[PDB]
Amino acid sequence: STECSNLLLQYGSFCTQLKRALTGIAVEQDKNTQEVFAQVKQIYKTPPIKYFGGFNFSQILPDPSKPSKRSFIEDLLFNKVTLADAGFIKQYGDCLGDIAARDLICAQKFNGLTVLPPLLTDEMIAQYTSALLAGTITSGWTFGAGAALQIPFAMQMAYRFNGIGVTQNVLYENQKLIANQFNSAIGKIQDSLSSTASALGKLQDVVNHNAQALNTLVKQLSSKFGAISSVLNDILSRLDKVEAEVQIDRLITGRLQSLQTYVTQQLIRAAEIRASANLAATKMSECVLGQSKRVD
Amino acid sequence: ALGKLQDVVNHNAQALNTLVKQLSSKFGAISSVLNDILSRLDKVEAEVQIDRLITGRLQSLQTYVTQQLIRAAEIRASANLAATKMSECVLGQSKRVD
Amino acid sequence: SVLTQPASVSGSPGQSITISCTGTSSDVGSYNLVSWYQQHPGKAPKVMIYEVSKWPSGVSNRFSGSKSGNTASLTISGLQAEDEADYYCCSYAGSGTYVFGTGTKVTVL
Amino acid sequence: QVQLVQSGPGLVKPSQTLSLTCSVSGDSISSGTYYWSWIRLPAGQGLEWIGRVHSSGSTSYNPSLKSRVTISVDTSKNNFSLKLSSVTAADTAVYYCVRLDNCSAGYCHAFDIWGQGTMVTVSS
Amino acid sequence: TQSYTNSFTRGVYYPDKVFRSSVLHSTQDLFLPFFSNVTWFHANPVLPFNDGVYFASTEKSNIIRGWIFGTTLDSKTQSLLIVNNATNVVIKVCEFQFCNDPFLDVYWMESEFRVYSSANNCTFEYVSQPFFKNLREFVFKNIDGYFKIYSKHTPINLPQGFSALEPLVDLPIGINITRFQTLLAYYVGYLQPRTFLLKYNENGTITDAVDCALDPLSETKCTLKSFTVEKGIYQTSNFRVQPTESIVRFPNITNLCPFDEVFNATRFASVYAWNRKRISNCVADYSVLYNFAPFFAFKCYGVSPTKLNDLCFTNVYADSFVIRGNEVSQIAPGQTGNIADYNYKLPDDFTGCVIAWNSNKLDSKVGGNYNYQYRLFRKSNLKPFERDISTEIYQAGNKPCNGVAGFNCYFPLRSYGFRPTYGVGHQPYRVVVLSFELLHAPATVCGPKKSTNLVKNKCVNFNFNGLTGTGVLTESNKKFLPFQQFGRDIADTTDAVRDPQTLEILDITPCSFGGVSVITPGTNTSNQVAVLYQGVNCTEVPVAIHADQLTPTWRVYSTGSNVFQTRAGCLIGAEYVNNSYECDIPIGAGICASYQTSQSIIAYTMSLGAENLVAYSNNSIAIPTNFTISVTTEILPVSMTKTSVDCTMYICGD
Amino acid sequence: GTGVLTESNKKFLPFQQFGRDIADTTDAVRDPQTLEILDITPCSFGGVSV
Ligand SMILES: *[C@@H]1O[C@H](CO)[C@@H](O)[C@H](O)[C@H]1NC(C)=O
Ligand SMILES: *[C@@H]1O[C@H](CO)[C@@H](O)[C@H](O)[C@H]1NC(C)=O
Ligand SMILES: *[C@@H]1O[C@H](CO)[C@@H](O)[C@H](O)[C@H]1NC(C)=O
Ligand SMILES: *[C@@H]1O[C@H](CO)[C@@H](O)[C@H](O)[C@H]1NC(C)=O
Ligand SMILES: *[C@@H]1O[C@H](CO)[C@@H](O)[C@H](O)[C@H]1NC(C)=O
Ligand SMILES: *[C@@H]1O[C@H](CO)[C@@H](O)[C@H](O)[C@H]1NC(C)=O
Ligand SMILES: *[C@@H]1O[C@H](CO)[C@@H](O)[C@H](O)[C@H]1NC(C)=O
C-alpha cells in the first residue's frame, strides 16, 4: 500500500536501524561459526591405514560414502535436530495453491520475513571438524602450536597420562584395557544418541525460539491496535483519505512496536548465543587442541 | 590494523548522529519544528501535534538507550576478557592453548 | 465422474426440444459454469453456450441455456435440419477440472 | 485467426506411450491468457477431458487419468504436447487439442477453439 | 533536423530556497534523469511539455530569443509567451493567436508580429532583466499553478561536468501547458519524478549529485547516503512486480434500491414505533440521497459516505422516525438518554450512517402536532434495534396499578408538542438510519460499479464485492463449503475468495517480490557491481521491459550478463570460476565473490585451506630441531564513549 | 525562536531566506528589512553536577 508507505516515511529512520541491527546479528552468526570451527591452518587428513593403538575412531571419522562426508555420530546429531528454515531457495509452487495454507514459512515470506543461509555449509563445517579430528589423532597437541608432528597414538596417550600425573608404564601395560574401555564408551555414546529422542535440547531450543519469535511477529499483523480493522485494504476501501490515514497511523504504530520488540529480543538472544560461541571456541582451543588442567 | 576500536568509535558516533537526525521526523505531526507548531496553531491543536512529536522523540531516545545498554554489555564482556588476559598472559605464563 | 445426459432426443421442425444434463451437487449445482457443445459429423465440437445461459459471439439466439438445482438444460426453439448434431454438456467440477456429459443425438423428422 | 494443428502418431500398441503434439498459429501461448487442454472422444462414449497446461508450466489433470498422463508446453515452438502411457483398447479415440478460456479473455470456462482431431487406435 | 544525444549529469537545480552547506541532502522532485536521451534540434512542429522541460543552447549569436507555452496555442485558450529583448525580458499570458511557425523579425526595431496575429484578453504581464563557448541551461516547470524557471550560464571548451541551475524566476500563472515551442541548435529533455542525493559544499553550492534510480551502484550510494562505497555486499531495496490491470467482480444485480420512498414519505413514524425497511437485491447509488432530503451531511460510523458506492453489503436496513433536535445527538453508538434507552438503541459496534434533517415545515402545527410520541418510562433499557410498542401502565411505585393510571402509575408514552415558533433544539427532525451488513453471506446490495472480466494468472488489482487487494488469482482446490465466501490465513489476510458471478473459488497469491543485494568492490577500485536476487530461482528473476511493472527501475540484463544460481539466490554480473580462493565478499552457502584479473567480479566456492596428509605410522615421530620466537598482536576493546542526554532539551528544546 | 543573533558569513544566494542544519532547525535567517544574514545560536546552557 503506497498510502501506508508514504505515512511510514514520516517516522524517520526506525526501519533502517532495525535493518542494520538484524544485519549485524546475521554477520555475527557467521563470525561465531568461523571462530569455533576454523581453528586449523590446514585440512589435515589421516593415512588410509586406520590403526591407532587399538582405539576405534570409525564412528567419529568421516564416512566417505555419504554426500555430506559426515561421521556416523554427526549423522545421528544432524537427524536429531529439525530446522525450521535453512535459508535455501524457495520457488513458486511451494507457496502457491493449497500448500501455502499448511505452511507458516510461506506466510512469513509473504509478510517480509526471510531467512538467510549461513556462509559455511554443513559440508564445510564437517570438513573443519574432520581436519581437527585428524590433527588430534595423528599429532596430538602439536598441530595446535605449529606444524603437525606425527606420533604413534599409544605414545600420545602415554604423554596424556603423564599430563594427569600417572606414569606412562600404566598406559603401556594396560593398553588393551584402555582401548577397550574407550571403545565401549564410544559405543555407549552412539547407542544413547540412537535411542534417546531429546538429547540435543539446547540446539532445538535455539531453533524453537527463533521459530516462535517469527510466528509471533506474523500473528501480530492481525491485531487492530485500536483501529477499525487490522486489514489496510479494508480501511482504504471503507474510509476517506483523512480517517483512513488516522486508522493507518494506528496500525503503523502497532506494527512498528512489534518489529522493535522482535529486534530487541533478537539482539539479546544474539548476545547469549555469542557468549556460548566464545565458550565453544575456548573449549575447542583448550580441550581439542590441548590437554587442559582446568577442573571440569 | 585497529579495526575493533575504530568500530566501537564508529558505532557510538553513528548512534548519536541517528539520534540527532531523528529530530527532523514529523511522526504524524504537521511539522517537525515545535516553534512552527506553536506559532501556527492554537493551544489545543498545538498540544495534539506536540504530543505526537514527544511520543516519537521519546521512542527514539528509548531505542538509543536500549542499544547502548546492549553494546555496553558486549564491551563489558570484552573488558573482562582483557583483564583476564592481563592477569594470565602478562602477570604469568599461561598453559591454556591459544 | 460424468454428467447424465439422455442418449438421444427427437423433434419436428418448428418445435422446441429440451435436452437435460444432470450432474452432482459439486459440478453442476456448485457453479454457474455450464457449457454446451454441438458436434456435426466429420467436424470438431463447437461451443454454443457458456456460463449456463450466455451466447458466444456469432451464435444464434434459438439455443437457450438454463440451470435448475443440479440439472442443466438446453432448449432449441424453431428446430430445423441445421440443428442435426451431437450435443454435449460440460461443467467445471472444481480444482481446475472439468466433467463432460454423455452426449445427446438430436434427430429431425 | 487462431489455428490448432495436431501431428502425433495415430498407431500405438498396448503398453506403449503416446507422443501427441499440437502447434498453435495466430496466438502466442506465452501470453498466459488461455489454458491448453487435451480432450478425447472414444467411440460410443461422450467427450472426456484429460488435462490442461498453462504457459508457466502449471497443469491440471483428470483425476482418473492423472497417474499415466503428462502434458507439456514449449513456448519457443508455440505448441503443447500430450503423453498418455499404459495404452490400452480404452485409449483409442479422437484426440483434440483445444484452447480453454479461464475467464481471462471473456468467456468463462469455455472450450472455444478446437483442433481438427487425430484418431488414436490401439492394437497389437 | 532532430538528432538524439546523451544528457550525462546535466539539469540538476536547487530544489528549494533553504541554504545548506557541507551536507548530503536527499530530495524527491522532477529531475532530468542522468544519461537520459535528449533531442538535439538543429532547426517546425510544436513539441510537448510533459511534466517539465530542460532546455539547453550553446549558441552565441543570440538568435534564440524566447519561448511559447500552452495547449491550443490559439486565442481559444491562454498561452504563455517569453521574449528576451536585447535590453530586457518580457513575459505575457495573453490569449495569443500564434502563427504556425512563429519567429521574431529584426529590421533596429524587433517586430512582435510574425509570431502572433493578435493578443486579446490579456491577463498577466511582467518585465525584468534579460537572461570556448557559453552554454546556457534552463529548466521550466509548471506545478502548483506556478511556472518556475531555473537557469545557468557556463563557459565550455553538453559537457560532462556538474553545474546546478539557480532559481531564476517564479510566476503565479494558473494556466494549462502541454506544448511548447522556441522563438528565433538547441537540446530538449524531459523531467521525471526522481530521488537525488545532492552534495552541498561549504559555500552552499551543489557540486555533485547521485541519481538513485540510475543503476544498482547509485541505489547503493543513496542507501548508504554517501558518494563512496567500501567493498562489500549491501542490502538495497526489494524488487516487486507491479499490477498490470484492475478487475472488478460484483454480483449481477439489476434493480435500483428504493431509497426515494424511504426519504420522500408523507408521514414518518414515531420514535417508539420507528419504521424499519429492508433493502436487498438492488443497486444502491448513495450520491442521490442528497437530492431526496435537505440534510446538510451524513454522519457515518465505520465507513465514509463517498466510499459507499464502492462497497457491497449483504443487506441494508433503513430506519425512519421523528425526534426533536436536542435528541439528535442520541442517535449514535454508545449513547444514553430517553431516546437511546427507551425508544431507539444503536449497537456499540454499529456500522452505518445517520441522516437527520429539520422538518419544522411538515411536522409542526399552530395548535401543536401531537401525532408523534416517545416512550418516557421503561423497566429496563432497550437492546440494540429492539422495538417496544407496548402501552402498559408503568408502575413506578410499589403500589400496583391494576391497569389504571394515576399517581406513580404513568402512561409510558408522552407526545411531542411540535410548534413552528419553537427554537431549533425543540423543533422536529426526521431521522433515517442506514445499517450496513458487511462480508459474510453473499452481497445483495451493491454500488453502481461495473464488473470487468476475471483475469487469472496475472498480477492485478482486484475488487471482489468491495474486498480489495493486489495479487495473482488462480483456481483453488480449497474445499469451500457453500456458505463460505472467502478464506483467511494466519495474518488474517484473505487468501481465497469466491467469485460473485461464477461462484468458483480462487486462490490469491502475492505478486512476485524479493530482496536485492549489491556486491561491489570499493568505488575507489571499480564502478562495476554484481546483483544478488535473494532466495529466487534464476528462471523467476524479474525481467521487465516496461518501467511500470517493476519497482527497481534500473535493469541488469539477466541473460546478457553472467548468471549463476547459488542457494542464496541468483547472482547476475559475476562469473563463476572453478578455482577456490579465500573468501573475500561473502555471498552465502559457501559462495564468495571478489574483484580479480581485464579485471571483473568472479564468484567461487570458498577454500577452507590446503590439504595436509599427516605421515602417521606405528613407529614414526616428528621432532623439531629448531624454533621460532613469534610475536603477535591481540586487540581488545575496553571502554566506549560515555554519553549524557538532556532529555528535556532533546525532546522539547527550550 | 530563542537564541543569540550574530552577523553571518554564510554565502546566502539572493533567493535564499533562511538556512537549516542537520536537525532541520533554522540556524540562519535573512532580516526582512536590512536583508542581512544572521546566524542563530542557542543560548548558553550545560549540565550541572553536585
Ligand atoms: C569399530 O567400531 C565399529 C562400530 O562399533 C565396528 O563395526 C568395527 O568393527 C570396529 N572396528 C574394529 C577394528 O573392531
Ligand atoms: C490540461 O488539459 C487537459 C485536457 O486537455 C487536462 O487533462 C489537464 O488536467 C489540464 N492540466 C492543467 C494543469 O490544467
Ligand atoms: C568557497 O569560496 C572561496 C572563495 O571565497 C574559495 O576559495 C573556496 O574554494 C570555495 N569553496 C569550495 C569548496 O570550492
Ligand atoms: C529453477 O527452476 C528449474 C525449472 O523449474 C528447476 O529445475 C531448478 O531446480 C530450479 N533451481 C533450483 C536451484 O532448484
Ligand atoms: C567448471 O567445471 C564444470 C564441469 O563440472 C564446467 O561445466 C564449467 O564450465 C567449469 N567452469 C570453468 C570456469 O571452467
Ligand atoms: C601397525 O600395527 C598394526 C597392529 O599390529 C598392524 O595391523 C599394521 O599392519 C601395522 N602397520 C604397519 C604399516 O606395519
Ligand atoms: C635455526 O634457525 C635459525 C633462524 O631460522 C638459523 O639461523 C639457525 O642456523 C638454525 N639452526 C639450526 C641448527 O638449523
Author numbering:
A (entry chain B): 743 to 1038
B (entry chain A): 941 to 1038
C (entry chain L): 2 to 110
D (entry chain H): 1 to 124
E (entry chain A): 22 to 64, 78 to 141, 149 to 172, 183 to 208, 213 to 239, 261 to 673, 686 to 742
F (entry chain C): 545 to 594
Provide text from the study:
SD1-1, SD1-3, and SD1-4 are from two BA.4/5 infected vaccine breakthrough samples, while SD1-2 is from an XBB.1.5 vaccine breakthrough sample. To determine the binding modes and details of the interaction of these potent neutralizing mAbs with S, we determined high-resolution cryo-EM structures of complexes of BA.4/5 spike with SD1-1 Fab and BA.2.12.1 spike with SD1-2 and SD1-3 Fabs. SD1-2, an IGHV4-61 antibody, binds in a similar position and orientation to SD1-1, but shares only 72% heavy chain Vh sequence identity. In addition, the CDR-H1 and H3 of SD1-2 are two residues and one residue longer, respectively, than those of SD1-1. SD1-2 makes a footprint of 660 Å2 on SD1, slightly smaller than SD1-1. Upon binding of SD1-2, K535 forms salt-bridges to both E554 and E583, both of which, in turn, salt-bridge to H109 of CDR-H3. The disulfide linking the 6th and 11th positions of CDR-H3 makes hydrophobic contacts with residue L533 of CD1. CDR-L2 is not involved in interactions, and other CDRs make SD1 contacts similar to the corresponding mAb SD1-1 CDRs. Mutations T323I, K529N, T547I, T547K, N556K, L560Q, A570D, A570V, T572I, T573I, and E583D had no effect on neutralization, however, mutation E554K led to complete knock out of activity of mAbs SD1-1, −2, and −3.
